[PDB]
Amino acid sequence: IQAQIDIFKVKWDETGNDIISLANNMCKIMMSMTEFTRGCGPLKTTMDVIRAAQEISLNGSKLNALARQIGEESADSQTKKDLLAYLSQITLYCQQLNICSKVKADVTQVGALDSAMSLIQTARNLLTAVVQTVKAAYIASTKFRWRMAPPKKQPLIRP
Amino acid sequence: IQAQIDIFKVKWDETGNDIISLANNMCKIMMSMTEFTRGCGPLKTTMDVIRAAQEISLNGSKLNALARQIGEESADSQTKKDLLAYLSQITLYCQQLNICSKVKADVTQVGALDSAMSLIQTARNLLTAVVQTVKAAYIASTKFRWRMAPPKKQPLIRP
Amino acid sequence: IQAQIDIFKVKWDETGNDIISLANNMCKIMMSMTEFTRGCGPLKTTMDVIRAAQEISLNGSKLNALARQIGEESADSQTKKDLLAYLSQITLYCQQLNICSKVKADVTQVGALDSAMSLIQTARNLLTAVVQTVKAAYIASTKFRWRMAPPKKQPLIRP
Amino acid sequence: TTALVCDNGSGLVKAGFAGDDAPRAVFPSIVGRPRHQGVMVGMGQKDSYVGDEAQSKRGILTLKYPIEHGIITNWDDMEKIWHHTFYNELRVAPEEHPTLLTEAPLNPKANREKMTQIMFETFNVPAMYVAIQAVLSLYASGRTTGIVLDSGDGVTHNVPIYEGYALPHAIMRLDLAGRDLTDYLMKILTERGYSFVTTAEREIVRDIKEKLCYVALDFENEMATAASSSSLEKSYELPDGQVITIGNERFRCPETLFQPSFIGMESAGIHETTYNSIMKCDIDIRKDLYANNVMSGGTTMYPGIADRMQKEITALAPSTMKIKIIAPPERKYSVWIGGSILASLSTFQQMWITKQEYDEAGPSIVHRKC
Amino acid sequence: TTALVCDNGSGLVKAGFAGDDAPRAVFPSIVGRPRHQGVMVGMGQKDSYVGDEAQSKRGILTLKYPIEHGIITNWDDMEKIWHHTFYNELRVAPEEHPTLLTEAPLNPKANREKMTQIMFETFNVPAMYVAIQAVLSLYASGRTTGIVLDSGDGVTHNVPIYEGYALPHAIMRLDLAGRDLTDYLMKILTERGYSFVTTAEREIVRDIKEKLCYVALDFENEMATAASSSSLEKSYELPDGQVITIGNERFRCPETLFQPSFIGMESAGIHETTYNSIMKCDIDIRKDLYANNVMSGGTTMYPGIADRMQKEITALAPSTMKIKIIAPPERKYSVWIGGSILASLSTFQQMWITKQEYDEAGPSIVHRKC
Amino acid sequence: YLMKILTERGYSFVTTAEREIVRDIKEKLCYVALDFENEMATAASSSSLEKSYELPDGQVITIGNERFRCPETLFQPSFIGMESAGIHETTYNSIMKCDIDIRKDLYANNVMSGGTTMYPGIADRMQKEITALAPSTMKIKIIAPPERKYSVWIGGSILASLSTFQQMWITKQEYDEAGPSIVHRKC
Numbered sequence A, B, C: 001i002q003a004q005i006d007i008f009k010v011k012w013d014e015t016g017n018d019i020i021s022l023a024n025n026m027c028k029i030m031m032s033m034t035e036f037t038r039g040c041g042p043l044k045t046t047m048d049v050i051r052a053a054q055e056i057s058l059n060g061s062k063l064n065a066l067a068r069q070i071g072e073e074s075a076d077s078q079t080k081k082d083l084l085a086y087l088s089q090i091t092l093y094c095q096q097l098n099i100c101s102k103v104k105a106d107v108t109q110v111g112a113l114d115s116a117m118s119l120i121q122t123a124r125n126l127l128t129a130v131v132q133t134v135k136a137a138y139i140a141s142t143k144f145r146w147r148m149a150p151p152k153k154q155p156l157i158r159p
Numbered sequence D, E: 001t002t003a004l005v006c007d008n009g010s011g012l013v014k015a016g017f018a019g020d021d022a023p024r025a026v027f028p029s030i031v032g033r034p035r036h037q038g039v040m041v042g043m044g045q046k047d048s049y050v051g052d053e054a055q056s057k058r059g060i061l062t063l064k065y066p067i068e069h070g071i072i073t074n075w076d077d078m079e080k081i082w083h084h085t086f087y088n089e090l091r092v093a094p095e096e097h098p099t100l101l102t103e104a105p106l107n108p109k110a111n112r113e114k115m116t117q118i119m120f121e122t123f124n125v126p127a128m129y130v131a132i133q134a135v136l137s138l139y140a141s142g143r144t145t146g147i148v149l150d151s152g153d154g155v156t157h158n159v160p161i162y163e164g165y166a167l168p169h170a171i172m173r174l175d176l177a178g179r180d181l182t183d184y185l186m187k188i189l190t191e192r193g194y195s196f197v198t199t200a201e202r203e204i205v206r207d208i209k210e211k212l213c214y215v216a217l218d219f220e221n222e223m224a225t226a227a228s229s230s231s232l233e234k235s236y237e238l239p240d241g242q243v244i245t246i247g248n249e250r251f252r253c254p255e256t257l258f259q260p261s262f263i264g265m266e267s268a269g270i271h272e273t274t275y276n277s278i279m280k281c282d283i284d285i286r287k288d289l290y291a292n293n294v295m296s297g298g299t300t301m302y303p304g305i306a307d308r309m310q311k312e313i314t315a316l317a318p319s320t321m322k323i324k325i326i327a328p329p330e331r332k333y334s335v336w337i338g339g340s341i342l343a344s345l346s347t348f349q350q351m352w353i354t355k356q357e358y359d360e361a362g363p364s365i366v367h368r369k370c
Numbered sequence F: 001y002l003m004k005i006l007t008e009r010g011y012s013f014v015t016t017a018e019r020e021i022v023r024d025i026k027e028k029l030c031y032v033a034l035d036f037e038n039e040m041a042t043a044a045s046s047s048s049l050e051k052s053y054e055l056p057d058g059q060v061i062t063i064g065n066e067r068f069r070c071p072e073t074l075f076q077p078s079f080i081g082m083e084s085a086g087i088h089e090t091t092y093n094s095i096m097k098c099d100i101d102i103r104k105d106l107y108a109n110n111v112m113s114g115g116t117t118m119y120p121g122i123a124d125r126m127q128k129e130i131t132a133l134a135p136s137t138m139k140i141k142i143i144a145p146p147e148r149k150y151s152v153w154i155g156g157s158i159l160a161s162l163s164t165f166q167q168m169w170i171t172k173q174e175y176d177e178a179g180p181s182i183v184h185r186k187c
């Protein structure tokens, strides 16, 4: 997921920087929570994971607004419809993250890892639906009437 | 193929030496690869054969440029049209050598003799189309308005 | 189908008359059932069609026996093999006629035209395989070591 | 600028830039559409998934190939596939790149006319060209004299060429290819008990065919060996954890190529088709065509097809001639590498069908130019 | 002697003697076993009830069909069923009668191998033979040229035949049949409020389906008519005196055959399956296959299936060809009547798999002979 | 060749029975154009040349330009990759290999036989093609009897029933004496 953003190099070019920055923050928090899953990471308390999930939800709302602006700026095409579909998915995931974070906070306060497993899963679903929102928004704003490098050569022989 | 160049002895006489030198280098590399086919030769790795093929392609581009210069220097005739046809053939063979050499390099890097068989075949096609380019260029530049010995006597009785 | 028998004019010449008589009876019953299909005919009840089908089956068994006798009387040839193939076809059709006639009788007794359609179809298949059994038997018994007229002239121009 | 080379096969789409040596995008040519009922709001807005995103989500889709036997049956889906290739996979605006498309020989003329019309009116490419696939395979094989067997997923065709002069009366196009072998593998898999019926299960059977199936050198001896002992059985694990085991179906599926009577087809196998294509050419060039049998396309990658085809042809050709089958390890991408060689040539740049010519002469210019 | 003809379908067992025109034994293919607790001494010694004695006592049993989708899943139960058929229903010693068994096409090979082994080792029959069911249906239809749609309780398969020469590449076996329609009827019956969950209640729902359900000629018009007025509602009385009423479920249950997407299946309906099987055959025989659409099996007895299928095929076939569906009134027993025709033939008596051949070659002789 | 060029429209006939269907299409529809280039121009400009045929399974095909392209192979055998000259140049070359005195009598009697010479418009086209080769003075006329499909057999009837011919049969006794090589002496 990180590689799809990492091929970005420096409408679009006006709100593009904000969106790429938000996606990069999302990926940073995402691997924060992933490292929590693996055991060693910046955040070690389930409360910290809930705070990180709420942060990802807030970034998702912001990126959703920016991508909606780009989407209505652009012209009718297939990539616009893909972008709108991904925006709906981001909306659903953000709502899930909010309410589930509040529920897990209350459950933890009333008195472990499996509490944060579902939050990590929902945030990972959200992130997967963002790297397809930046690409669709970029293509819809640019190719129709930052940068992304052309894809790498496919191997001729696969062992 | 070597004999056709070997009858050369020392427009033309200004760029002739360059062309004959390039053709001689081509023949030297060609029998290098042929000796690789027979088993014993200066180069023994398929990577070496790919490097030799790329070298022959570079020499082909240089000789193509020189022969084109001679061809436009010369006057309208039938040998000029033969020369232009052979130049087109050299262009095709050089492009084939480049791209196929890169493909075989990648195939060998991803992890034998038959890999170099087609490169040898294409280089041999290229060489056959050069010894007919030096002769046509020589005749077009000289006989119309180095040296080549007159042809040997044909046998009166063939056993 | 009637025309193929109608070209007969008066081993073979010992059992030939029996076979031609049986085939003529078959054709008479066949057009009886065909006229039933067209609406106007000697027989008007589906029970009558079932009785006619059983009669054709009985005639088929008799003609099969006679043609088998002629076939083993005759000598090895290609027409003998054709005759044996047609005998096998007649056997299959006769068995079908018997069992299907009994089934249709029971279906009609327990309480229309489509009931007799399949019986007519099977009897017509049987008849087509008889006019090729009389001809093959005649040729196998006679030409190898009644009458049939030579075929009519083919038109020179077909409009 | 730099020219595109889109080799839209019947089963896989392989695109890239001219002058390179490997495609950038290689994805299946399918267009799935969801068939179940969506219950979560916001999920299910996307009506159709194309290419690689319909191969991941195939559990809830009906995958439908737009190209079928090399002939584009569905045109809206193929516009979807081309849009995917240009924008979402290669990520290039088509307005700035000429496009080199490929096509099997002996296809309908409406096929070329509509590919040209779609490229010049929907994608607004500045130039294009449609090239026969076996010619490009001979380009990428590094020769100019051979007979190019080019199997695939749609068709299997030969093009005999002698020193750059193709012989159009000896082109033999056979409609037996990888997809027919997949369907026959499904049929013969029903014998062991495994029933694959859906489209996603067609893709599972295709993967079984790629992983396990091979070509027997001697069919009768291999059937005897497979019946006598269980040394030929190999197991495959389905996407839900089940394990299958196919011992005799391994070489029976690709034997359809050499005996097309297995699937009810009358035509002769690929060995007799190649030999008949050779002996339709002029007598003087049959010796040079015998020694250069370039094999291309995906379907010619079964383990042991070169040896078997050499054995089958050598039994037909005269005892004196030297038969050798050329099977490069990269032969799956030979057509595209040939497209890279052709589109990047200095000589070729006068042979594009420019947009101005299309405006003058309409979509019937592709028959004159190509 | 006289040969037996045991047509062990997936839902009903129909046995008899060759040469007759009607089966002697027709009983369901179920094997019930009591599940409650026996309290009276001497009652409850019998561990399993088979066939008709498990359909009367179904109130205290768990009925289990041994054959499931034409494939015999349970072999001990199927030995029980065959023992019942031979001894308690037909009342013949199997040692003195050849047996003609039937089987759907495209089944596993282990199915034939184990039926042969059980007949030759457990029942000691002197000879046997396994015949595809649609071939026998075409025997009993009185023709030699047709395409035999043969529904049933397990499977629904086509076999196109032209003048005694079957086309094995155009055999289309679909696994949608009467039992799936019964389960779908249970599902849609839950809408009105009636919940049938047990196996005995599966049998009650099967009887509802047989008595009431029919096939609509035009589905949308019939749904509109059923929603507008209550003229389509018919009542059925359950075994405990309760009365149910199904108005819209009558033609929705058998519509699953023509739209197998009702029960989540992807495959095309029986009309498209028949048409696809027709246009896989050679071009010259499609006209003769169009005019002879023999329909067999129990499931093809819904009131109005012939008219609907003719309407559906006529919309697919070219406007010139003459489509007519052949639906004999006895089509439930067409396979068995075909078995009687085949087993009693003079020509056929050299095609039995004799016991000596089985001793020589083992249970793999059935693949060569049949 | 008709099968090959039929693949262009979309119709693919591959089997032997489908060869027979294509043969029937050729017999029913195909004809010979008097001027090939003008007919190609007419066929491309308008759809007045398209005629439909109904296959044995109810499908309808439509061939407009393949009608005169199939029998044009006779006059340009380079369509199917053959080198040799058309039937008009073959007839003219056969005429000018004969002695000079009989070319005038051979020009005026061009008997056409066999089935393939029954395309609608082959006599007019062949007369036009030969007249452009022969000297302007000689009178060219092609003899095309309406029964020319059976001309060889009618000639067999004329020859075998002759009074003079009955001494030219290869009798069985001669075959017994001389073996199967008698047919080269007698015939």
Ligand SMILES: Nc1ncnc2c1ncn2[C@@H]1O[C@H](COP(=O)(O)OP(=O)(O)O)[C@@H](O)[C@H]1O
Pocket (backbone or CB within 6 Å): D007, D008, D009, D010, D011, D012, D013, D151, D152, D153, D154, D178, D179, D182, D206, D209, D210, D211, D297, D298, D299, D300, D301, D302, D332
């Ligand atoms: N390694 C392999 N072994 C056997 N068959 C293969 C293999 N790889 C691909 N195929 C077959 O080849 C087909 C892909 O061929 P492809 O190269 O895409 O041809 P095209 O590009 O003309 O469609 C697939 O459908 C598959 O059945």
Ligand SMILES: Nc1ncnc2c1ncn2[C@@H]1O[C@H](COP(=O)(O)OP(=O)(O)O)[C@@H](O)[C@H]1O
Pocket (backbone or CB within 6 Å): E007, E008, E009, E010, E011, E012, E013, E151, E152, E153, E154, E178, E179, E182, E206, E209, E210, E211, E297, E298, E299, E300, E301, E302, E332
């Ligand atoms: N009159 C009928 N109307 C509708 N469906 C029927 C009728 N009779 C039987 N069926 C269905 O057909 C099935 C019986 O089919 P059957 O003839 O036994 O096929 P098989 O012998 O192959 O099992 C039953 O399960 C039932 O659902």
Ligand SMILES: [Mg+2]
Pocket (backbone or CB within 6 Å): D009, D133, D151, D152, D153, D297, D298, D335
């Ligand atoms: Mg390909």
Ligand SMILES: [Mg+2]
Pocket (backbone or CB within 6 Å): E009, E133, E151, E152, E153, E297, E298, E335
């Ligand atoms: Mg049945």
Ligand SMILES: [Mg+2]
Pocket (backbone or CB within 6 Å): F114, F115, F152
């Ligand atoms: Mg003749």
